[model samples]
Target: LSKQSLNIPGYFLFPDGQRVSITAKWTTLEVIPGKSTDMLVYEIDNEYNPVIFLRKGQTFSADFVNNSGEDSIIHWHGFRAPWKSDGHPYYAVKDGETYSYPDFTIIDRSGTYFYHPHPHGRTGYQVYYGLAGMIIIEDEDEDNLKQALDLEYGVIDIPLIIQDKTFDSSGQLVYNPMGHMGFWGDTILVNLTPNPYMDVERKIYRFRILNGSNARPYRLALLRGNQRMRFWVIGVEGGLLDTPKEVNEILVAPGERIDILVDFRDASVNDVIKLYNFPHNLIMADNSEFEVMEFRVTKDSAYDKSIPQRLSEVTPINTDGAQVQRITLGMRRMVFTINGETWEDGYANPQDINNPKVLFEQNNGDVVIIEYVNNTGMYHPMHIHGFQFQVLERSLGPLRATDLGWKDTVIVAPMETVRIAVDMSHPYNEHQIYLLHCHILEHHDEGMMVNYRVNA
Candidate 1:
């Protein structure tokens, strides 16, 4: 079966100032049956591809029709949109109504991002029913690369949305929080297709991949047999790093994006290569790692051998000159933290009195640092809004060049401590509070987030 042959609905937006509108309707899903649960799914005139492509400095608006029994809003994850458009629990889209998510700007560096419902406890459920999609930020710099490749990149471009699910006999999903955590599924779905496989033409392909699962963190790798293939990670959560970092396998947590380039031109036709997720600490009692997809090279093509050793030059920020801050991570209750505090429902977490805003200030010249300590038993991927950061060190020492680019999100493993540094600075204000939280939505909804103003 050819994977590309499937007639899946897709929505594409170009940078030509297109008017993109989306509607969120209330729909019931038979997750367990007798339990026809009410949820919200977005479709622009019956289209299933609920994705928005962003261009630098472009503004878009969304008219959300709340057809559900409750109130909700759209949160543009990873985008530095206005505070009111952030879809906070306080700012909601009520039942049987339409809410305007206007002033949506395509402002951010070139990278892979995603969006989902952020209505507290209901986040995991809504996302389970296909409420997520990948967001790609394009700019002149990233666009020029295609020209360098002689317009050869798009032919090998692919978007991979990796998610896991459980289904019943009636073709419905099974998501229940009756166990230890909540909503862990049996059947895995990548882009809503079961047992998907991709066919290749023996060339270099760019995969903009996202881990959209509610709580599942993936340890993605190729089959052990195809370990000889070279892969370079060109971008992380916030966008293109200073350059591409070559690696074998990269770990991706929920709400995180990895832009990778894989070379398969040397492989022969009819050869099948499988992408595998190693069986590790994914979730509780989840220990099956087989082939997620088979990449079958169907033909031979003239491949390009010019792999740019240095992709881009990344700027760094310093922390020594400005106000120094400390953030912490945990796993109980909310299961994550920033500094020494946790976000309480209905109550605001206190911000630093002197420096309420979180901005990038140059300390030295190339040294930027922010201390993050994870004091939990389970893994939590810590992500920041607005800027990409490099992992400086866990406890001490020199940071690696692989960690030398722009990254908004960094995986803070269990019982580990990491400090990240970035470039740029912003002012701290009451309305412009930056978010630093666990990317795992389940943990995020449970309270693993904090609000910080850049200047206090």
Candidate 2:
């Protein structure tokens, strides 16, 4: 794990720059190795997809400077920031306008979250180009685990942003989406590096993986040659699961985060273990399968770190007498939607006021229960803003390991029904507005989003 973007950052920011939050300017990032070709990189930092590290309970303050020539806003996806800081499309800033996410404390747990453009029509284009980053938060539990192991960020603890992209013959990034089904790029990128691989030491390493693809889902696994290798699934979106599940494979949808630990302590040196993506049963992804990256065992290390059997204290949210909100993911008039209404219809668009209607509303301090029934032919990776929920049950389709803990996003497979208990206890002064949208960037751009209000 060298000083590659795939690896964690040695330091949070540049040594000489001001201690500001980030800058969303257009910069060139050399994607293909050993080449003059550099994609017009628009990122949160000078690097492509810069990773932000923060501690739990720390107050976050920054000016999300929009140095580009377009209207955009950065949504702290999977974060419980109030409605003001949520970066709703309605709050988008124009070119050269800085959207300052003023003083706000992160009360959420330690986990792998991400930041990306959330402008209504440009989210897909911006993120497709290069406007995204990873947020790694740490808490007391995470610190205790670090005390137990010599795991170091940028070294053994790595963050990988897996995305698919298309490049023209001139090697420039392409942004043509055939339709709302999703953008399936011919090439895949890990931290903007095409055909990327990491050199690893013989030790237990943690990988915080995010499905940064537009819509493609990843069936990720580790392979030494062709055989699958087991890894510990220790984390979901919100935080570490109660117990790590040793699984050979995991299904990750867009906007979802999965943290895994692979024990390379016993692997033979010079051997290669590939982080492979296999075929999935989904509609758009069934025909695609390729190598995500490789773990080349390059050195021998004496560190034998043991992952805790019970990583965190995660308890189920009680929904005994909670009101249930039944929702549906389907298309109306060839446009994706949640509960049959476009985002413009149900969302209070502050810009173009349509006398918007907030269809879903619940009292504050409630563990709101939501059930998603997706009978559409496409997979809907539903994402809810400002809250991390617990998956209660899966009435249809198989309940995968990701549902075993707190999640900010979940894949509602075609013809599947999933129930979740949402923790929406955000004590803001005014009534807060949040989003419920599909993670498929194309679908999201096509109006598969809605607003849910929390009466505070």
Candidate 3:
């Protein structure tokens, strides 16, 4: 374990009126404080996965250039991207190839989203070696909050991409080749740095936390020397919460994001608080309890901004006259499958990666209620690409605080069925095929994924 200062990854601003270029390549970084190791990264100019800042409602024009010496594709995780630019595995490009996605408007809410390689079998491998990035979309609500709370990006408002990783004795990252069950790391890393700590001022801070781990679901808690500390959860995957929910701990699974406000002003300078992941006794679960990172108060600021009580609102999705569908997470011969089938791919022809026989087809403006039934007796964070939904009901599972907001992902407990209202009335183009899958990278790569088509 390497104890070091938190390495803040670089940042990049999305296009204003011109197109931007993103390149992927094999790079090197000092992941062990002194020794450099190879990493697969998404870069623009020189910064890879630079906490990309994009404005809502802006037109997008970018090309993904691959130089990683293998087949890869970029999946715009949690965004309602069109089928043409959804980065389907069928369009995986080889080294020195470029895939262009041009002239698409951004309509997602202001939140913490991300991008990563999605080339069928190679996805877990690429992301495990560092080929992932975080996205921050700006809108009226986000701007207002920053102004009202006197928050600054990379300052009081911090982005934490929490990940668990395994490294060799020489400090290089390890990628598993036969992780059909799942992969768990013993070493915890924040922003690709192991055993990290951040120096902060004695003030209220906003943290946008993303569980970038491969398959781990952490019961996150902030501790002041073994005692749980209070913080406010202000948002979830899709966007800001209507009001802050005071809590001392939260559950964050892979592919899920949480926004929080922590009051560090109560502590004096030189105070150290640590974030921890506690083990759970939930039925049919994995236990990984450890310390994640730390915050050391190094300075004092005259901060007195009150945490906003009312942040946003969630309009309950109307289920009247809405179509209903059932998606089952099952296992066939001990192999995980979505609806009893794996993702089908083919050569460059008229073949699509989606299964049309059991297709979920909808028009551009339609409402649908989907029941995600988990029969595998294991927790699956079911993720739906290209849309966000509100949980309608949870049958036989504990509904956590995260279920009250618009979310692109949900943790479906073992033997539980969750019903959610999916809004298809959005700004996406027709003939769009979106992925609905288990977000555990290992599970996803092992065939727990399928597709839905719009106007098919």
Candidate 4:
């Protein structure tokens, strides 16, 4: 057991030196082996902390300044961009060389997304230092809902970025690469603070939560003691669910995003609410594991009470109509095979860089269904580019209340099979071919990703 203070800073600015619209900037980060003090680098325009909101079709750029004496690149966790702008290992910013990462347009489809360092072999280490943040894509669709809903109520919308870290004696982050579990941390931080609390007025609020941990899977819930808090899930990783599903417990795997709605309108001014979690014991050794955030309900606020029974309708894709493509996900040496062939089989290798991929087509009004089965113990957050789908079924189980809506990403748990149906009517990409892969950075880097084409 290591008893060390792990102090990582929260809230960085985007530096005031140079200002450019539609351009993102990256600065050098200095790591002092052990200390509670944070080495502040960059800040956004307003001193309003670090949550940034971008819009669809808007262009964003970033210049990665590698100060850790290593080469690194930033990968936008859920954003769909061209391969070049996707921050693959092929692109790098050397020790002192400032790489001008090209700016790309953010496509339509809103929800919560994240960004982190993707340095091939060192990605697990770079992100462990507390370098990730939340990126929300806003559009007329989401904004209209905000306008229709009451601003204050039982619950107000909030964003939480959860991560874990193991510190050295001096309170600095320590990364262990030799261990089988590449990078696992003991300390949990929600928005950079352990067991952090938020004060809110008694009303309805939305929590845009992301599980940003490298390997930790969290069992999240609300504690009203033996009585559970009533909350409904409104959205998943890529977009909103068909309808809200009330649940007391939510499981968030690494790279997964969940949007929840909670109401606290009946609580008194002094009433407190807590966010609880049952983390894996191997990592969070302590048997007594729980977390709660106090919300002091103050003034009275009015908001929209219309909770739509149906959020968005998704058409299922027909397997009989599908072109029939299958891919496997796992480590290279392990028992891994996509369509029964390992990565070494050359079937999953990228084709000519510039050649446009030929895609499987569905008629303009056809429903397209893709089946994915996970053969590994690790959970995979599957995300599809170009369009969203209706989670038709999982492991042969019927759709839940929360599974009714549209989604771009779905969690494929261990030994589980998921079939997602999509309609060919909408346009997410102009090109015929689309990409689908495990959102886990390490998995993608290890060749657990593949591309599929959808044609008209």
Quote the positional error of residue 252 for candidate 1 in Å: 0.7
lDDT of 1 by residue, 1-456 (tens): 234321132645734444545666666643342445444567675765444566787766666666545666666677765555666544566777776765556667877778776665566767776677777777776786555544332356677888788766656666765432434567665666667767788777788778888767677776526354558888777777666777777777777788888777746788777778777553343556755666788889887655566655566555575444566664445345555455563223234422333323232223345677767666677777644566767653344323446666676666777777755353323344556677766666666666544322
Model 2 bad stretches (over 4 Å): 1-21, 34-48, 284-286, 346-356
Q: What is the alpha-carbon lDDT for the whole of candidate 2?
A: 0.80
Cα RMSD of all models vs. native, in order, equals 4.9, 3.0, 2.3, 5.8
For model 4, how does the per-residue alpha-carbon lDDT over 60-148 read when each residue is reduced to its tens digit? 66565555557677667666665556665546567666556666677746677776766655666556655566767766656655665
Worst 10 residues of 4 by lDDT: 1-10
Q: lDDT per prediction? A: 0.63, 0.80, 0.82, 0.58
Assess candidate 3 and give its TM-score to the true structure.
0.95
TM-score winner between candidates 3 and 4: 3
TM-score of each: 0.83, 0.93, 0.95, 0.75
Candidate with top TM-score is 3
Model 3 per-residue lDDT tens digits across residues 1-456:
546888777788887657777888998888887777898889887787898888989877878899988988888887777766778776788899998875677888888888888887778888888888888988888888888799888888888899888778887887664436567787888888789999989888999888888888888888887578899988888888888889889888889999999999866798898888898443412585888999998999988899987887777888999999889888877678777776643222234344443247788778999998888957899998788999889997556777778999898888889999988866644567677788888888877777777763
Question: Which ranges of candidate 3 are over 4 A from the true structure?
Answer: 177-179, 281-286, 344-358
Per-residue error for 333 in candidate 4, Å, reads 5.3
Runs off by more than 4 Å, candidate 4: 1-49, 61-68, 98-104, 152-155, 177-182, 279-289, 292-320, 330-368, 384-387, 400-404, 422-436, 441-456
User: Per-residue lDDT for 227 in model 3?
Assistant: 78
Alpha carbon lDDT at 343, candidate 1: 56
